[PDB]
Design a protein around this ligand. Structure first.
Ligand SMILES: Cc1ncc2n1-c1ccc(Cl)cc1C(c1ccccc1F)=NC2
Length: 126
């Protein structure tokens, strides 16, 4: 029983770019979530082996985590802000899908998502 490879943090075939919205996403949006008290289960790829979740990667076929996003932003992996927002959005949704609606993790993701939404209200005009 094995974990999949984590999502790529670089691809030499994918065009790279820095935008003031991607800078804002790293310096502000990601710093804000990363430092949160509820950030810890989302700072890395979901370890199905270590966590005892043999069904996790049968259900969630597009995993994403903030460690992957942070590394993506640091390597200019994204072309635009929408790409990154999407990865964040995937992360949240993944959590919503797999967990029972009253699990603690679900409440944590909701707390991080409302924070996410607040922060991206001040995303610069590109
Ligand atoms: C992301 C994610 N989706 C599903 C899981 N997780 C998760 C990931 C990492 C860690 Cl350290 C715990 C959990 C936890 C978890 C988090 C907080 C409280 C209890 C838990 F089982 N559950 C499995």
């Amino acid at each position: 029983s094995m974990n999949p490879p984590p999502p790529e943090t670089s691809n030499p075939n994918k065009p790279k770019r820095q935008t003031n919205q991607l800078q804002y996403l790293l310096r502000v949006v990601l710093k804000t979530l990363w430092k949160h008290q509820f950030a810890w289960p989302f700072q890395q790829p979901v370890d199905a082996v270590k966590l005892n979740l043999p069904d996790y990667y049968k259900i969630i076929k597009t995993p994403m985590d903030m460690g992957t996003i942070k590394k993506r932003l640091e390597n200019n992996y994204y072309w635009n802000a929408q790409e990154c927002i999407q990865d964040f959005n995937t992360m949240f949704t993944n959590c919503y899908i797999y967990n029972k609606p009253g699990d603690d993790i679900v409440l944590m993701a909701e707390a991080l998502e409302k924070l996410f939404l607040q922060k991206i209200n001040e995303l610069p005009t590109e």
